[PDB]
Amino acid sequence: REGCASRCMKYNDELEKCEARMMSMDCEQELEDLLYCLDHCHS
């Protein structure tokens, strides 16, 4: 639900940090874990 979804913001945080690292120094693993998380909330 909306409760489950909040626990998937942490996966966006990790993706935000990775993109910063990527513009400085792939973040596909961090996105995959975000979509996985969002997918489980959906079903």
Instruction: Examine residue 27 and tell whether it contacts a copy of itself (CB under 8 A).
Output: yes
Please give the single-letter amino acid code of residue 6.
Answer: S
- Report residue 9 as tokens: 């913001």
Report the nearest approach of a copy of itself to the CB of residue 10 (Å). 9
Instruction: Examine residue 38 and tell whether it contacts a copy of itself (CB under 8 A).
Output: yes
Residue with tokens 């489980």: 40
Taking the C-alpha atoms of residue 1 and residue 41, their distance in angstroms, rounded to an integer, is 6
Instruction: Examine residue 14 and tell whether it contacts a copy of itself (CB under 8 A).
Output: no
* Binding-site ranges for a copy of itself (CB under 8 A): 1-9, 12-13, 15-17, 19-25, 27-29, 31-32, 34-36, 38-42
